[PDB]
Structure 1
Amino acid sequence: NVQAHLFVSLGTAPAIVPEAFLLPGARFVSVHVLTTERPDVTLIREFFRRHAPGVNLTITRVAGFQDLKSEEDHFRFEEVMFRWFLASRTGPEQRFVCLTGGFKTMSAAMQKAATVLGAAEVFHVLADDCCVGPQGRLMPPSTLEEILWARDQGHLHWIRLGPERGWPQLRRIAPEQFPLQVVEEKGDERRVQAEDRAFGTFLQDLLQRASRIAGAWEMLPELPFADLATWSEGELAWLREPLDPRAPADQRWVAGLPKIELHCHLGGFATHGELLRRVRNAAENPGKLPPLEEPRLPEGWPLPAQPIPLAEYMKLGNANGTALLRDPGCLREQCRLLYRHLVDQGVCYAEVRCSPANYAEVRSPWDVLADIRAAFQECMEGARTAPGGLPACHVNLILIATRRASGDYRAAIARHLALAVTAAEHWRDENACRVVGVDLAGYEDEKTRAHYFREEFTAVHRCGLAVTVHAGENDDAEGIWRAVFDLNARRLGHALSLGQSRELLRSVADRGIGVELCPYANLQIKGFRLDGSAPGPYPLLDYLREGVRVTVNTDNIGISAASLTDNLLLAARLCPGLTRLDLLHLQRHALETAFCTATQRLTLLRRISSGIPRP
């Protein structure tokens, strides 16, 4: 019922196409013949003129192939063959391929094309000596009547190799992508050319990718991302080696990674240098600006020789914050520079903490929050890069409830929680900046543990808002236990003492509660050995091996004076033996513990999977 085209190759022995056209069962239409320059085709044309008028025979010749000496012209013939198969518009269900005729390599190319593109039947024809000729027991060369006689009395074989399936993306495709060129053209006869070997590279790379995927099909659920299955064996072996922070190639690779940020404070971004000057030279009221004064950093501040405690760590960012963000222009400018920095670092999703009520003097905290939200929305709408018309970096908001050692600090917590609930219920567009949770931070000790604020957070739990708690930075595991089991926290920050209790660590691992680590902040405050030279070993590797969803963050960019890339590199330095697959696992954990919707999570997963740079 199908059209049943017949593709055949021709050598220097004519009367092959007449034999192949005669098939016990096939009603062939539109016979196609592929041949070189020298063979003659008069006999075939006479056959199809006298015995089958309606078969509209077409003959194609390769432009510059007449005798093969090297491999260069074989590649030309193969490329022209592939484009010639592609030139017509036929599915595999109506393709019959005959490999008889031509050089020994031409038949191999015939079968390779048939098994790659797909065909209904691959076969070849044989005939034995039956004609007396001038020399006894001679093959029937010509003089069609003896070919028909041999068919009728019946010794022709027609060995049927069988059907072929073909790769699915190559079954149809299009010929406009890979066209041919006609050099000279007479009736039903052509000479053709191809500019390049694009189809060869396309086919080769798709087969190579398929071979790699078949090679890496096991150990797939252990892989953080699916695209890693398309990597070569050498690349995968290199991925399992320990990361070397000194090597510039490793630094470039880490800088080229898509990243997710979950712990970043807005008030500690621009505290020194040119960034502070740029923020200051944007105020609407320059008259009321406080006099410029930069706190002096300790010796070798990025990597101090001695640890320092919290008080001067907070005082080190006195040049920015409440003293400076009280001006609306400064707040806007701060937001723009933070978004620019996040985009430059390669982050694709970030959550930013803020304390709007600290910046309200004549305006309400609602106005401050609206200003921050509008500035971030305008920044996201400005940079419509990335595929699908989505912002380069998506920013969500988290509000901070601060607790202090003494004074008046507990009314502000209530104001922040109420504002967070109202704002979360106000803005609800999925593809926009939103308030997605609250955070309990500040001074921590025995008297300010988590279970003393349950009555304040009951309303937050009633309204359905996510909660993160700072715990374990300067306390034992009891604070972490109370945060987990009394405030129903979903994420923990600076849980450095989680390893003191095995049962608590098992509970955190089993419940999927995320942990956030900041290598620079932890090293600068608690002190830690570097390069394997009494706080103890850094607990990153222990958490990774135990099964905890641990992530690496930046905390205060300005105060600690570094970014995500530097934090990852020092994470490698603090735990010798850390691998690159561990970095990918960290990114996967950050994706899984984010405070986002399911569709956004899937989109981020796809975006990160295809963005990992190769060695």
Structure 2
Amino acid sequence: VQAHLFVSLGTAPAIVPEAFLLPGARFVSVHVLTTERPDVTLIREFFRRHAPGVNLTITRVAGFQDLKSEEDHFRFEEVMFRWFLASRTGPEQRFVCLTGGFKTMSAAMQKAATVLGAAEVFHVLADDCCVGPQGRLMPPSTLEEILWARDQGHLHWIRLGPERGWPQLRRIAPEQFPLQVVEEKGDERRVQAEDRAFGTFLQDLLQRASRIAGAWEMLPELPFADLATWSEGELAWLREPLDPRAPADQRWVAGLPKIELHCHLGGFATHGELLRRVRNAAENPGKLPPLEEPRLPEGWPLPAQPIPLAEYMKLGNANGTALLRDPGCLREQCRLLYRHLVDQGVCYAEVRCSPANYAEVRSPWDVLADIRAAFQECMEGARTAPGGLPACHVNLILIATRRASGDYRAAIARHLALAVTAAEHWRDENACRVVGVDLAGYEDEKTRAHYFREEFTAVHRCGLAVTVHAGENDDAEGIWRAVFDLNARRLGHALSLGQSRELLRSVADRGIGVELCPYANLQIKGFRLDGSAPGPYPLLDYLREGVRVTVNTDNIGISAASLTDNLLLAARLCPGLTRLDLLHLQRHALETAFCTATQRLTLLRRISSGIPRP
């Protein structure tokens, strides 16, 4: 109910104290400007009296004596707009006055109230109030006739209708439209304006709504609907090549809301302090394995030579099946992963795990229950304020197991049966829930999974999604079979699709998604970096054809990189990538998720109103 007051002052200073008087409407603050000519001494005396606690921010122009030239008009409008900007208050809290002014045209304030939302407009009136010595309604000597008129009420205040403001400018910040203070003498200040950028922005917003000449190419092909309210200069910044080494471009990617779809729980904390923290919350300290940390190759984030997959897997042999057989370690790892995900700014994640691996005495169901309980407790604990919803939704995807010595059919059957029952058990739509399964594996699984299509027909009826990790070999026939027989909806990696036009066109048309991990691909398969045997990274081509490409993290601990670093490295690998392409990537990732329609709408609202302005 903080009613910050915005009153203009003319050559008559009675309007300030009088419009201060209002039915109720206790004012936390009062903001006024004038020109250099009028004095402030009697306003000083007035404010020293019964209202000393409130502040009186009286700002002044750099130079002004009258408003008769047009230049005076644009300058006054600009300075007044930057006033209202610098006030830093909610639209429902701003109040507008009689706007008398020293013939300040009295209309700029109404224009501001119309374009920028406010709460109310009132009009002071003088009726037999403060009858002066001359007989006319002169303002009091200092304040005595104010009290006199308040005693016998005829003056009053004529109140107009409230305004809401234009939808586009209703949300805005003073940082992109600042002002320079010439000098501040106590509560009084003198400021000045630089350029009519705000007027240019308003004129652009008016003009693009009429013609379609220049906006016709730009607006219709924009990823999010909230990007149509940006200025012409900002939209030009968005259509320029992204520099991954600029100290300013790095802080923009760090504030974007992000969606994550390829993460592994068993490869998070494998080195450094986090390993110590995980190895501290163990329930049974007596059976923890000896602390050995594998040695990373030279310049590990950017190795000079590709390493094979087996060495990559063994690089994380300090936190996995060895450590996650103790419940405390499992819970602590879940909590740390959630905290890191929240810090990165992710708003929706899908963690992949295989409960069978971390089970030697307990059953897989107990491991799944513990994981779900930990994640749900964290989600309920966080509960930030997008409307009461948790800060980061987390779902679950069940990948197959590793110890494939027992009967393969038995392992597959157990893996799918655990998923179906878990899907049936947790049916609430605001909590962790198993959403899909993974069919990673070929050769033996190629001979088993693809042939036994009838095995994977129950899952389809139970409401679960299927993702296939097309890793090594990456032949075309496997992709054809995965797309058309297994009815998968997302593909893993699959970096070679441009060697068969029919497959690329089919994948583009049907809508299947593709998941790419820059750091892992560079460190495992090898790729050229910067401007200068594998070919170019197939990200720009996929984005141009119309495929739904995403960028993910894969293994956070083994690769030692986060989502932001992955995006910047993706910018490095393909020269020419623009920021609009990053927003396209986010939109595609949102589209290809496994959530429900209500969650999709909520995520769209959250993302579209979070993009930081340049």
TM-score normalised by L of structure 1: 0.70
Asked if the contact 1:256/1:346 (under 8 Å) is kept, the reply is yes
Deviation by residue 1:197-255 (Cα, 9 ceiling, x = unmatched)? 99999999998999999985763331111121122212111111111111121111111
Distance across 1 between alignment mates of 2:151 and 2:265: 92
How far apart are residue 413 of structure 1 and its match?
A: 2.2
How far apart are residue 272 of structure 1 and its match?
A: 1.1
How far apart are residue 468 of structure 1 and its match?
A: 0.3
How far apart are residue 464 of structure 1 and its match?
A: 2.3
Distance 1:560 1:4, change over 3 A: closer
Distance across 1 between alignment mates of 2:525 and 2:260: 23
Distance across 2 between alignment mates of 1:385 and 1:21: 38
Distance 1:214 1:282, change over 3 A: farther
Distance 1:222 1:187, change over 3 A: closer
How far apart are residue 22 of structure 1 and its match?
A: 31
Q: Which has the larger displacement, 112-121 or 415-424?
A: 112-121
SS at the partner of 2:445? coil
Asked if the contact 1:477/1:500 (under 8 Å) is kept, the reply is no
SS at the partner of 2:450? helix
Deviation by residue 1:251-275 (Cα, 9 ceiling, x = unmatched)? 1111111100000011111111111
How far apart are residue 500 of structure 1 and its match?
A: 2.0
Distance across 2 between alignment mates of 1:178 and 1:45: 30
Distance 1:50 1:348, change over 3 A: closer
How far apart are residue 159 of structure 1 and its match?
A: 26
Asked if the contact 2:474/2:494 (under 8 Å) is kept, the reply is no
Distance across 1 between alignment mates of 2:361 and 2:18: 97
Asked if the contact 1:326/1:359 (under 8 Å) is kept, the reply is yes
Asked if the contact 2:33/2:58 (under 8 Å) is kept, the reply is yes
Distance across 2 between alignment mates of 1:152 and 1:121: 25
Asked if the contact 2:282/2:327 (under 8 Å) is kept, the reply is yes
Distance 1:131 1:553, change over 3 A: closer
Distance across 1 between alignment mates of 2:100 and 2:231: 39
Asked if the contact 1:529/1:537 (under 8 Å) is kept, the reply is yes
How far apart are residue 81 of structure 1 and its match?
A: 13
Distance 1:175 1:508, change over 3 A: closer
How far apart are residue 345 of structure 1 and its match?
A: 0.7
Distance 1:373 1:500, change over 3 A: same
Deviation by residue 1:264-323 (Cα, 9 ceiling, x = unmatched)? 011111111111111111110111111122222222221111112221211111111111
How far apart are residue 475 of structure 1 and its match?
A: 2.6
Q: Show the 5 A alignment for 1:194-213.
A: none
Distance across 2 between alignment mates of 1:253 and 1:538: 24
How far apart are residue 555 of structure 1 and its match?
A: 0.8
Identity of aligned residues (%): 100
Deviation by residue 1:150-207 (Cα, 9 ceiling, x = unmatched)? 9999999999999999969999999999999999999999999999999999999998
Deviation by residue 1:519-555 (Cα, 9 ceiling, x = unmatched)? 1111111111111312221111111011011100011
Asked if the contact 1:217/1:229 (under 8 Å) is kept, the reply is no
Deviation by residue 1:314-350 (Cα, 9 ceiling, x = unmatched)? 1111111111101100100110010011011110000
Distance 1:101 1:585, change over 3 A: closer
Distance 1:321 1:445, change over 3 A: same
Q: Show the 5 A alignment for 1:362-401.
A: 362-401=361-400
Q: Which has the larger displacement, 188-197 or 460-469?
A: 188-197
Q: Which has the larger displacement, 589-598 or 479-488?
A: 479-488
How far apart are residue 438 of structure 1 and its match?
A: 0.4
How far apart are residue 48 of structure 1 and its match?
A: 34
Aligned length: 614
Deviation by residue 1:429-484 (Cα, 9 ceiling, x = unmatched)? 11111110001124668955851453432221222210001014433122111111
Asked if the contact 2:129/2:154 (under 8 Å) is kept, the reply is no
TM-score normalised by L of structure 2: 0.70
Q: Show the 5 A alignment for 1:544-555.
A: 544-555=543-554
Q: Which has the larger displacement, 292-301 or 545-554?
A: 292-301
Distance 1:254 1:291, change over 3 A: same
Distance across 2 between alignment mates of 1:487 and 1:526: 27
Asked if the contact 2:128/2:154 (under 8 Å) is kept, the reply is no
Distance across 2 between alignment mates of 1:293 and 1:45: 74
Asked if the contact 1:517/1:553 (under 8 Å) is kept, the reply is yes
Asked if the contact 2:530/2:575 (under 8 Å) is kept, the reply is yes
How far apart are residue 50 of structure 1 and its match?
A: 39
Distance across 1 between alignment mates of 2:298 and 2:471: 27
Asked if the contact 1:91/1:172 (under 8 Å) is kept, the reply is no
The two structures, once aligned, show a CA RMSD in angstroms of 10.6
Distance across 1 between alignment mates of 2:313 and 2:131: 108
How far apart are residue 357 of structure 1 and its match?
A: 1.4
Distance across 2 between alignment mates of 1:79 and 1:289: 68
Distance across 1 between alignment mates of 2:267 and 2:141: 92
Q: Show the 5 A alignment for 1:404-443.
A: 408-442=407-441
Distance across 2 between alignment mates of 1:300 and 1:579: 28
Distance across 2 between alignment mates of 1:325 and 1:51: 69
How far apart are residue 387 of structure 1 and its match?
A: 2.0
Q: Which has the larger displacement, 471-480 or 367-376?
A: 471-480
1:309 counterpart residue number: 308
Distance across 2 between alignment mates of 1:55 and 1:354: 59
Asked if the contact 2:132/2:140 (under 8 Å) is kept, the reply is no
How far apart are residue 365 of structure 1 and its match?
A: 1.0
Q: Which has the larger displacement, 580-589 or 434-443?
A: 434-443
Distance 1:145 1:466, change over 3 A: closer
Distance across 1 between alignment mates of 2:56 and 2:330: 78
Distance 1:237 1:120, change over 3 A: closer
Distance 1:489 1:121, change over 3 A: closer
Distance 1:319 1:218, change over 3 A: same
Distance 1:259 1:212, change over 3 A: farther
Asked if the contact 1:450/1:479 (under 8 Å) is kept, the reply is no
Distance 1:184 1:501, change over 3 A: closer
How far apart are residue 382 of structure 1 and its match?
A: 1.1
1:561 counterpart residue number: 560
Asked if the contact 2:267/2:557 (under 8 Å) is kept, the reply is yes
How far apart are residue 117 of structure 1 and its match?
A: 11
Distance across 1 between alignment mates of 2:48 and 2:353: 86
Deviation by residue 1:329-381 (Cα, 9 ceiling, x = unmatched)? 01001100100110111100000001111112222111110100010001111
Listed as ranges, the gaps of 5+ residues in structure 2 are: none
SS at the partner of 1:59? strand
- Rg larger in structure: 1
Distance 1:214 1:98, change over 3 A: farther
Distance across 1 between alignment mates of 2:24 and 2:275: 85
Distance 1:532 1:433, change over 3 A: same
Asked if the contact 1:10/1:33 (under 8 Å) is kept, the reply is yes
Deviation by residue 1:581-603 (Cα, 9 ceiling, x = unmatched)? 11100000000001001111111
Asked if the contact 1:5/1:30 (under 8 Å) is kept, the reply is yes
Distance 1:34 1:229, change over 3 A: closer
Distance across 1 between alignment mates of 2:2 and 2:82: 21
SS at the partner of 1:396? strand
SS at the partner of 1:385? coil
Deviation by residue 1:35-73 (Cα, 9 ceiling, x = unmatched)? 999999999999999999999999999999997699999
Q: Which has the larger displacement, 88-97 or 343-352?
A: 88-97
